[PDB]
Design a protein around this ligand. Structure first.
Ligand SMILES: [Zn+2]
Ligand SMILES: [Zn+2]
Ligand SMILES: [Zn+2]
Ligand SMILES: [Zn+2]
Lengths: 147, 138, 75, 129, 75, 147, 140
């Protein structure tokens, strides 16, 4: 197991970034349960969102794999919790390490972009009727992210 | 060494399924799109050539246990079929009857399983069996 | 004039001349409703219409009616 | 072997940047503080350390955050890397890495992992700190 | 094991057999610090060590300390 | 004083090289009284030789100046103690430090080159009759370097 | 700022001496080649033109103290000469008599000293003095 993994974990453990919780699984070190507090003054805010992070052995060569385990309303997160963030795909560079990624996700909620977001339907509403969409997001948060 | 959590592994399978594979004679994919747990899955087998099965479509249902892929997944046909290992009443496959299910390895994937069944249809004991009229189910 | 239609509901009416290219047409739709030209797939007469060709080419003429199907995105 | 210094004037790293100098490095891998090397270049045209003939613009600045060095990719410290028999390396963009990680980073993309500047096998060389 | 003290005064440690040629050792130094061996001059007991000979030849042993200077002709 | 000079001075004080002894002068910091033990299997060997070192301001830029204060029989060292070593003139690199030079001189004792030489008379003797010269060197050591 | 130690300084001079300088009217060098301490220098001056000194050759002994170049060096003629400042008995030069020796500075070197003496020979008070017959020497 590469030294790096521990360290990153360790500082993660030793120090926690605000608005986030990251617990490694006991069975496997490379696997993580992460809980993200919704951005303040975001419709999500007040909700808590589960994610799971895993890193292929190839990491950092290979970007980590991240997914939402909590159902959430957003253009860039699909029905299965799959996130479309570019730093996970094309833009991935080894230096970045998890801690960063996580914050990057935190931002995304705050800053929804319709940029080939997978869910055009989410996209469609968000461009057409942002007000509505935002309301729906809050709804789902209530429904799913309050427990 | 390297342990791959279920869900992520399931995703890996899912992505490959959508891509489709090779001949495309067998295919798999998810039963319901709103399921986060990726448990309920649908499979398709195309009946191998020059056997009573040939030129036929069989749909399956596959469930993936919490300890998939460590434990093998439960499988059953939805289209009617006469076959060793395949319970006729239920269209459910006895684990032990089938070598891969009996000898399950965490490495095996659904894809493997289906080819397995397809492969198995061609075997002498099966290829000979009379089959029902097209399109009945249990 | 011609009418263009959706899976949705709305009928939109355009002003075009038979010379007009398919690309050209898609732009007009893009302008009215905000869907980019590469997203749009357009159907008439049991056929998908291609960019280089003209309306005359497909013999669409008389205030004919067209169906718009939009690509779902899964990148 | 420890915090970086410039062997001519013998300042530490802090001390070097503190007064608005650069840390730079030859094409032959030898490191100095930019003043000192410029002044040396004033009198001859050879690496003060190995005598390589540079003749100008065969050197560039490099960037390192702490003064001690560590490859950001694998997250190793100097001792660890060397003892393994790997080399410390810099891109021509001034960005430093253990040989191994970088080699492998190129196998996928041809861009620097810190900044993105285009690169290839030719564009990086070892440094000896 | 052998301690060579470099130009800057830092000690670096090497792994070797007394059989090892001086030339061979110079390579190991080049590797660590990037000086071509032509340019290296190696000193022990106030004496410059010559390429063809072995460490044993000069009776340098386990944990002996070696001093490195730049190739000089004198003259 | 320039930092480097101090470190070097300070560094010399901190950790002695063996058979090489170097004490700065009280009146001038840049001036040094130095003692070199003859290298092994030299004729000088088990000998003691005084040298004096001064460094011009331009140093490191300008090489240090070194001279023997002890009379010695050698092709490179003339009658007045002037040493003809190339790193003191042409090949001077700022990277070289006092401690290095010193060892270089020590080394030089082991390997005299009359191929080209300063003190020509000696050189002639050394190429023509090395055996003799060596003996004379030992003589002079006895005569001059034993106190 | 920077103060040079004696020993290296003397070599500088020595080298310059061997190189020779200017019109070669003054010349200096070590009295003996075996002395490491560089204590004693021989100097030589040529009598300037149009004076009773002209076309005459004067040898000087110069001693260079441990204190030099801060302190001025001691100077004697070996060749007999009539001249102000020059002690007739001993052929020794009184420090104070001569401006440079009186007003000495580290920067000054043997070369300057000699030149000074040469110039002085040309001064009115000296130039007209009759001289002893060529080739006599003070005792010593
Ligand atoms: Zn410097
Ligand atoms: Zn170099
Ligand atoms: Zn690395
Ligand atoms: Zn870079």
């Amino acid at each position: 197991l590469p030294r790096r993994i521990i360290k990153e974990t360790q500082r993660l453990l030793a120090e926690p970034v605000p608005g986030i919780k990251a617990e490694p699984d006991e069975s496997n070190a490379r696997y993580f349960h992460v809980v993200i507090a919704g951005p303040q003054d975001s419709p999500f805010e007040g909700g808590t969102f589960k994610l799971e992070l895993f890193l292929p052995e190839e990491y950092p060569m290979a970007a980590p794999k991240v997914r939402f385990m909590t159902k959430i309303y957003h253009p860039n997160v699909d029905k299965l919790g799959r996130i479309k963030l570019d730093i996970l795909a094309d833009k991935w560079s080894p230096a970045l390490q998890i801690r960063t990624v996580l914050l990057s996700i935190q931002a995304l909620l705050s800053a929804p972009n319709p940029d080939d977001p997978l869910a055009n339907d989410v996209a469609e509403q968000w461009k057409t009727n942002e007000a509505q969409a935002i309301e729906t997001a809050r709804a789902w948060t209530r429904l799913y992210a309050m427990n | 060494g390297v342990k791959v959590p279920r869900n992520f592994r399931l995703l890996e399978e899912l992505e490959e399924g959508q891509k489709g594979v090779g001949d495309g004679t067998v295919s798999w994919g998810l039963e319901d799109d709103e399921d986060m747990t990726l448990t309920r899955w649908t499979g398709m087998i195309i009946g191998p050539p020059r056997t009573n099965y040939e030129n036929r479509i069989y749909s399956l249902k596959v469930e993936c246990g919490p300890k998939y892929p460590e434990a093998p997944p439960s499988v059953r046909f939805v289209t009617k079929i006469n076959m060793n290992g395949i319970n006729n009443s239920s269209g459910m496959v006895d684990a032990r009857s089938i070598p891969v299910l009996a000898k399950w390895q965490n490495s095996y994937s659904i894809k493997v399983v289906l080819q397995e069944l397809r492969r198995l249809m061609m075997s002498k004991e099966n290829m000979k069996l009379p089959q029902p009229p097209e399109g009945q189910t249990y | 004039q011609i009418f263009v239609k959706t899976l949705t509901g709305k009928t939109i009416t355009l002003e075009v001349e038979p010379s007009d290219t398919i690309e050209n047409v898609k732009a007009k739709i893009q302008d009215k409703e905000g869907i980019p030209p590469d997203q749009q797939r357009l159907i008439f007469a049991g056929k998908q219409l291609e960019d280089g060709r003209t309306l005359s080419d497909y013999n669409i003429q008389k205030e004919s009616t067209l169906h718009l199907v939009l690509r779902l995105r899964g990148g | 072997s420890g915090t970086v210094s410039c062997p001519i004037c013998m300042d530490g790293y802090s001390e070097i940047v503190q007064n608005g100098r650069l840390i730079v490095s030859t094409e032959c891998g030898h490191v100095f503080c930019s003043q000192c090397l410029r002044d040396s270049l004033k009198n001859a045209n050879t690496c003060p350390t190995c005598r390589k003939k540079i003749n100008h613009k065969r050197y560039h600045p490099i960037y390192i955050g702490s003064g001690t060095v560590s490859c950001p990719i694998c997250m190793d410290g100097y001792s660890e890397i060397v003892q393994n028999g790997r080399l410390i390396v810099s891109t021509e963009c001034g960005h430093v890495f253990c040989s191994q990680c970088l080699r492998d980073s190129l196998k996928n993309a041809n861009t620097c992992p810190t900044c993105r500047k285009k690169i290839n096998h030719k564009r990086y060389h070892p440094i000896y700190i």
